[PDB]
Design a protein around this ligand. Sequence first.
Ligand code: AWW
Length: 455
Amino acid sequence: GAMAEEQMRLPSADVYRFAEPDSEENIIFEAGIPIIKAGTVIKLIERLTYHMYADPNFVRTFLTTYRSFCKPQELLSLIIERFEIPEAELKRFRKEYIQPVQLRVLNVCRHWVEHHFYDFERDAYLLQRMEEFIGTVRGKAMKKWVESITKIIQRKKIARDITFQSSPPTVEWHISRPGHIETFDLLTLHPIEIARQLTLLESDLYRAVQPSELVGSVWTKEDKEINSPNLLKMIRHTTNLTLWFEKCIVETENLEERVAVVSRIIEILQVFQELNNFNGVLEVVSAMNSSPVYRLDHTFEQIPSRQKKILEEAHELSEDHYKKYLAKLRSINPPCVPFFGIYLTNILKTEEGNPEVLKRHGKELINFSKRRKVAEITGEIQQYQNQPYCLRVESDIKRFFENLNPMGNSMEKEFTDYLFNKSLEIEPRNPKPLPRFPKKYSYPLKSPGVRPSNP
Ligand SMILES: COC1=C(OC)Cc2c(nc(C)nc2N[C@H](C)c2ccc(-c3ccccc3CO)s2)C1
């Protein structure tokens, strides 16, 4: 009948793999555009280039997350296989099936090269594969798609190899003067300017992270450096700044000097708060909560009450699954640098909390809802990625913070053991006595404060 007339108009299974019937054994949906829960890769590709309607949500999310279940080489071949459909009925079949599916495939190619060129930048063979495919396309409406895609391939070819709206404030200095990079340090640089330069650095690092770097826990795999470079730069910066804060504290063995170091780092946090760099606030909080620093009760004692409160209120941002942090983040306007660590925590819970596959009628379907959920979290990341700061770069201070290496030649575990042993040395556990230590700093320790220029 008329049901068979639709299917028999389409190609049979012996000549074409992307036209088998929709069923409980190959595809599952969660009225309008149906949201695909799970399915085999063949059925996911079919829906990615479906003839009845455009699915821009599915295209975006598929291309962001497909590497967790399908290689780029495998994907390119499957969309070419979808494209090469075997041929009044012929004229209607060309009208309603061949032309729209071929239009949808090229839209996927256009999206792929525009938004995920790094695949083609990684694999040289994948690019010349993609260009050869687009080269062999002859059609009426198909010509401007070929020009539009090859336009973008040229834009990314040249891309392979700052302006302010308002007047940015004066770069502030303290002990170290412009150019004297050998004297640059925590207490010698201006605290305001340390916060500004770290925020600019972290903002740039936040903005460079792409969605695919976070999918499938690929930053903790054998192939992490090419799959997740910007992500790894962000994580490593945080590691290096946090351990550097801890090192500055615990290697200051004189109590009164250590109090000054801690107080200065609290001031850096205060300026991060003014800038809405929440990444920076929680790096300071992490450093202050770490095993070596948190146990220094004698250092805590001499911190002014108002600074104590600032740290205590900053910690409380993290309590109850970051409730107050999330409310603070929604309440502010740009520019900001969101706390990056929460996205990794929630992505890991989603990855670990949902299975790779779903069984239905004794066959393993790919869990696409798992990928979309991860992609929804990366969507939140992206909405804070176009927020430039009205702040002037200082190249020497930037370079200093970009090249932090507190661990030196040590391993992380080894260095954090050293930090804790150093903590025990400077403030021994009770009932052992507290020894006095000599001063290490020859310059004045009084801070210049966090109020900028223009009295
Ligand atoms: C549940 O356990 C809690 C924590 O675990 C580590 C931390 C924490 C908790 N409640 C609050 C309000 N604030 C906390 N941390 C903030 C950031 C800090 C206040 C002061 C700090 C400090 C700094 C330098 C030297 C010494 C100390 C402290 O002896 S660190 C509760």
